[model samples]
Every structure is written in C-alpha cells, then in structure tokens.
Target chain A: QTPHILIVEDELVTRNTLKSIFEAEGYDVFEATDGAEMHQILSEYDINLVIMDINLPGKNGLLLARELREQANVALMFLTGRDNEVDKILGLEIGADDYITKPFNPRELTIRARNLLSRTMQ
Target chain B: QTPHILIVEDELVTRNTLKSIFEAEGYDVFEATDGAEMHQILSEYDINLVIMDINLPGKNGLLLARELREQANVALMFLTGRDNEVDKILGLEIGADDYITKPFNPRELTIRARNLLSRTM
Candidate 1:
C-alpha cells in the first residue's frame, strides 16, 4: 500500500490544493466534500489516514472522526479554523492522532502526517 | 481464504450454537456479546459477513447494520425475534442481504448464509 489518504474538506480551493500537495508527495489521495462522500470513499478504499476539516458543510469532522476511530484502525488528523486552545485539545482528546490549525503550512502538515503514518505502520 | 463471519448476538446459547454451526462448515467465526464487542471485532477482523440480532443491549442492530452497510463492503443478515412482516421488510429494505426469525432451523440458517455469502464473495 502506498499509504492512502483521504482529505475531507468542503472548500474546493483548499481541498484541491491539499490534494495536489499530497499527490505530489506520492500519496494515494482521495477527496470528500462531505460526510456522505467520506463514507463512500471509506467503503471503497482501504484508507490509511484521514485529513479532515472540522468545520464542514453538513457533518463536522469531530463526529465523523469518532465514528472512524471506533470502527477502523486508521490514523486521523484534523485541520480546523478554530484556533482556540480548547478545540485543539478536544480534537486530540476525541481520538485524533494529530491536529493542525487552518492557514497551515502544507510542508508542516505533510511532515506531521508522515510522522503519524510512519509510527502507525511501524 | 476461509470466510470469516462475525456473529453479533447477545444471547450466549444462540451465539455459541451459531458459532459452532459455522465453524463446522469451515468458517472462521468470531463472536461479540454486544455492540462494543462487535466494533472491536470489526476493527480487528476483515469480516466477510455479519449475523446480527435486531434487539441488542446498548445499541439496536438496525442502526449498526446501516452503519456497516455505509462504511464497509460486508454482507449483512439479521437474526431477530421480531417475526412481524413489517420488521422483515424493514430489515431487507435497510440493506440486510437476508433475514431470519427466532427459533430458526439451524440447517436453514446455514443454507441461507451459505447462499448469501457465496453470492457476496
């Protein structure tokens, strides 16, 4: 497996940019605009990790993350505009392996993701 | 590969009987006492099929079955005490491949499971 990653972001510009970055880094990338798309991709692909935006259009990332953590052995990371310390703490506490705030550095995001995936696979 | 089946029934006797029946048929059977155990087994095993009871302790089987249908490509069947026509129709409509009522014939359950798994696999 080439370490499949699903980017569940509703914003088109942000989603596409992140997809390009991950794909360029040689990851098998999948994209989902909402919770429904997320589940469809999860049913279809053996996803290794998920990079989800917390503030989504329909269902939020935190809710979906909890469901995934309960049912699957997949790494989870969150990207959110909520820079509040409480939300950050909540994200990791709610089973996310890592968290990142919006206006992020793609390089740093990739590094954090890589570190999580490497540790998980190991 | 030997087909792996997970039986998500809270009743011990029923669960064990089904487990033995499937194991005798060469299936790798896993048992779960409730929804929590079911999730643990699902996370660990690449289950080919799930035989779930509609009435569970914490969470109902219909909700779990729908969740599995949405998130996994596993075949689902219900073993329920609810023999009402409405419940049977509801189960199949909600993505269960088959449904069997309580006090089921072991041989019939086995055959139905075999046909469903064969087609699904």
Candidate 2:
C-alpha cells in the first residue's frame, strides 16, 4: 500500500519541490498552500504523513498541528526554515513525530520520513 | 542535581574541548582517551550521558557502544566528524539516543544533552 503524504507549505517552489521529492520515492504526495487547502486535502485523502512548514499565511503549521493531533493519528513533521530549538520543542510538544530544518538534507529527510512512517504503521 | 557526562575521544585537543564544553554548562564531565580509559571512568562514576567519537584509538565507538548498550541503560550519543546518514542510522540502530556531527553547535549540543538527561534521569 502506498503511503499518502501531504505537504503543507505556502511557497510555490518549496511546496512543489517537496511534492516531487516524495512522489519520486513512490509516496502518494499532495500539496497545500495554506490551512484551507490542508484541511480539504486531509478530508479528501487518507493522508498518512504531513510535512508542514511553521510559518504559513494564516493559521500557521503550529495551530494546524494542534488540530490535526487532536483529531487524527497521522504522522506530522515540521520542516521549518527556523533552526531554533524553541520551535523544535514546541513542535514536539504538539505531538509532531519529528522536526527538520529547512534546506534539510534530502537523504536525511527521506530516511526520517521512512522512520516516522514505519513507527506509525507499526 | 548535577549530571555526570563522559567524553570519549582519543585526540587530546578534542577530548579536552568536549570536557570543558560540558563542564562550563555545570555538568560533572569526565574525559577518556580510549576504550580502557572510558571503561575505567564508567566503573568509577554514575555517568548520565556519554558523548563519544565514532573513531577511537582502540575498540572504536561502535564496538564500545554495543557493549555499553548491552550492559547499561546510560544515555549514549555519537558526536562524530562524519555526517554520513549511514553512520547516523547505524548509531541509532545500535541504540544511541542521538548522533550529532563533530564541530556541532554548542547550544544545540547542550540542549540535546539536557534533553537526553531529562529523559533518562
């Protein structure tokens, strides 16, 4: 079974790039520019994982994560531009499975993504 | 209240630097140049964390980590110069709590150390 991943980033380049990255690895990848698109995608697809950015146009990733965790068991990872520890801790507190900094190593990202997916699948 | 941490690296410059790094943060830090010294320190103190280099003069970190994990529940972190994902995955598979690259961010190191200590202690 293919794992569905939702990329919740507002930027065109970043969101499209992330969509391709996972799609190349055989994941059923979906893209969302903001919270509204994210909600619609989640409701429409059986998303197994969410790769979210911290800073969004409205109702940022953090706020969306609280609602996601409150509602579902889907794995969440914060791919933030900020490498701040406070942000990392906050995402973890919100039940994010893992948090990686932006401009992250593509290899590490895939590996971590698989790690999170494996754990959740089990 | 103070956590005991062991710094395991064969290079004197690197070993001492790691010692001072943790000591400055109020951790009771001990230094070891090789597996023998590391074993001796472990026998003598209740170490909360072990920041080990992947390459050592004898019985490199991976081997030592396997033995340590088999013997104790102490938190272990691999602070290696290599940023290879294979090494990172290997370290994690060996039960390491974290695998940080060498020349790491001091703030990040301290924070990660504290996080491991809090979880273990």
Candidate 3:
C-alpha cells in the first residue's frame, strides 16, 4: 500500500516542496494549509502519517498533535523553525513520532518518514 | 486514505485507460501485466482493490483471484472479454467482489468499483 502522507504546513512553498519530494518517492501525498484543513483531510483520507509544521496560523502543531493522538491512529512528525530544546522535548512528549528542525535536508525527511512508517504500519 | 487499486491487465491500452480513469477519481493506481507482477505489488503496497483482466499472457485472472482470496484481504474486481454467465458465476464464486464484462461503459465501471470498494474496503 502506498503510505498516504498529509503535509500540514502553512507555507505554500514548503508544503509543495515536501509534497513533490514524497510523491516522487511513490507516496500518496495530501496537503493541508492549517489545523482546519488538516482535520478535513484527515476525515476524508486514510492517512498513514502526517508531516506538520509547529508554527501555523492557528492551533499550532503541538495542540493539533495532542488532539490527533487522542482521536487517530496516524503517525506524526513535526517540522519547525524552533530548535529550542524545550520545544523539541515537548513536541515529542506530545506524541510526535519524529521532530525535524527547519532548513531541513529533504533526504533526511524521506528517510525518517520511511523508517517511521515501516515501524508504525507494522 | 485514497484507495490504492492495481490494474492487472496485459493489454497496455486497456490498462492505461483504467489507470487514468481511476486516478482521476482520486485513487492511487498500480499496474501489473501478469500474476507475478500482481503478487509483487500486493507484497509491496497496501492495496484496497484490484481490477484484473480475465485474459492475460499467463496464469489467468481466475487462478490469480483464487490465490488472492487465500492470502489477502483486498477487494477483487474483474474486467473480462468473456461474457458467459458461467465465467461470471465462477469469477464471483472464486471471490471477486465484482465482475465486469468487456466493452464496458467507463461510468458503470467507475460506479461499480466505487460501490464495491465502499462495501468491501
């Protein structure tokens, strides 16, 4: 099964870039601009994993991650500009499967996603 | 999760047409020309449905459907040139979720597939 991934980033460029990267690797990628779009996509699709940005227009990634953990079985990874130790620790504490700081390597994102999917989907 | 469908047909024209049709319907489509390719795809991806041609180069769709029934939880639908009632009966008996005869209307094919996936997947 192609692992369906939802990219929840507010930045159009970052979202499209990640979408292209994962789609090139044969994943079924979906996009959401913010928390509401993310929920709508989640409702419509059987998403295997989510790649979300921590800083968003509203209801930041941490809060969304908590809500998703409460309701969904999907795997999550956070991408953020904030590299503060507390935020990274808190992100993971709230149930992100992985945390990646921005200005990220596209290759690393793909690899981590693959690893997380292989482990979680099992 | 978009339903990932595999089209296992030997004819390139028919296969591409079906792939295009389903992809337009928001499905993640995969293609295979024979039984081996079908199994390889099943092993790799989490497929929701398979639209297979009854006629193929080798190990025809009936046998493949039977094999899939034994191993996978995926939904099965057949596309065939054979229109005989017996073949249709046999296809269903062997575990195809739906059977579509050849020269099929694209809209009917899409609707039937949607219904089958909605029911089975």
Candidate 4:
C-alpha cells in the first residue's frame, strides 16, 4: 500500500504545492490548515507520518506534537521558516520525528518523506 | 539544577565544539565517542537529551535510539553529514526527538539544541 502522509501548514500555496508533489509521487497526502484541523484529520485517517509547520494559527505544532506522542505511532516532521530555532526545537523536543525547513526542495522533501515512511511503516 | 545533554559523535572537534556551545548556553554537557560509550554514559548519568550521530563506530546511532527509547524518557536529536533521509526517519521512528544536518553553523545547532532542550524540559 502507498504511504499516507498528513501535512499541517497555515499557508494555502505551500499546502497545495506539497499535496501535488506527494500525490505525484503516488502517495496519499492529506492537508490541514492548522493544528486542530490536523488533529481532527489524524483521527480519521490511518496516517503513517505527519509533516507539520511549527508556526500555526492555534495551539501551534509543538503542542500538537506533545498531544500526538501520547498515544499514536505517527511520525512527525516539522516545516518552518528560516531562523525559527525555538519552534524547531520545541517541535522535536515534544517528540516530533523529523523536520524540514522552508524554501525546501520538493524532491528532497519527498526523499525525506519516503525515508520516514519506510522506517515507520508497520 | 541545570539540564544535562549527552552528545555522541566520533569526531573530536565537532564534539568539543558542541560541548563548548552548550556549556556557553548554560547547559551541562557530556560527551561520548560512539554509540556503545554513549549507552554506557547514558546508563550512568541523568541525561535529559541525546545528540546523536547516525554514522559511528560499533552499534551506530539508530541502534542506540531504539535501546534508549525502550528504557527511558531521554530525548534524541541526530547530527549527520550526508543528507540521508533514511537515517533521519529511523532515528525519529525509533524515538529521537529531532535532527540537524552537517556543515551546520554552530550557532544554528546550538540554538536548535537549546530550543529542543527548553521544550522538552
């Protein structure tokens, strides 16, 4: 089965772009505009990994990471703007599985995504 | 009390550099040359986070991450040279807290490490 991934970002273009990129890779992709929305989607889908943006509208990615780590086996990867060290660390410290910086190359992102999925896949 | 973080790497310069960086940031730091030594120290110290290197002599970082996760509440952040996504995911899936790529600026690494330490703390 193709791996399913969830992306949590507030920006529309970025979200759409990621969705297209991963979908083109023949993997299922889900998008959430904020932390809460991502959490809601997570409950519905048998997501393998989550790619999150730390600077979200509400609750932020760090909080969501903490909450998700409590029960789920989903791996997390953060996407954030440059110079956001605090956000990156918070995302990781709270148990985010991986991270990606903005202005990232799509191919590199997919490689990372596929790599993450391969490791976490049951 | 200050937080203690263990850095497990094979290189001396980078290890000392990271040690100094974290110490300057007011954190207590510990160093290990490889995964086996890291595990030994981890078993001995009250470390809160582990900054690991994916490529190391003996067991390697991923193995340590798996063992550590099964044993305690320590957080992990990997440091690597190649942009090897497989290692990153394995590190994280085995319960690493985060990662940083090599040729990285010390300032950037320190900040990210501090950020992870702060949140996990």
Interface RMSD of each: 20.9, 5.3, 19.1, 7.5
**Model 3 misplacement above 4 A:** B1-121
Colliding pairs, model 1: none
Which segments of model 1 are wrong by more than 4 Å? Answer: B1-121
Could you tell me which 10 consecutive residues in candidate 3 chain A have the lowest summed lDDT?
A111-120
Best by lDDT: 2
The CAPRI category of model 3 is incorrect
Candidate 2 lDDT over A1-122, as tens digits, reads: 79999999988998888888898889998889888899999998888899999888899789999999788868788888878878887776677766788677676677667655654664
Residues B5-114, candidate 1: write the lDDT tens digits: 99999888888888998998899999997889999999988898899998899888988887876787577778987567566656666667667777766765666566
lDDT of 2 by residue, B59-84 (tens): 98988998998898687888788688
The order by descending lDDT is 2, 3, 1, 4
> Which predicted model would earn the best TM-score?
2
Q: What share of the true interface contacts does each candidate keep?
A: 0.00, 0.00, 0.00, 0.00
Model 3: per-residue Cα lDDT over A1-122, one tens digit each: 88999999988888888999999889999999888988999998889999888888889788988899899757788888877756666676666756677777676567657645654675
Each model's DockQ score: 0.01, 0.11, 0.01, 0.08
Question: Compared with the true structure, what per-residue lDDT tens digits does model 3 show for residues B25-87?
Answer: 999999999999999999899888899888888898999898887887577788888677667
Error of 1 at A95 (Å): 0.7
The lDDT, on a scale of 0 to 1, for candidate 3 is 0.80
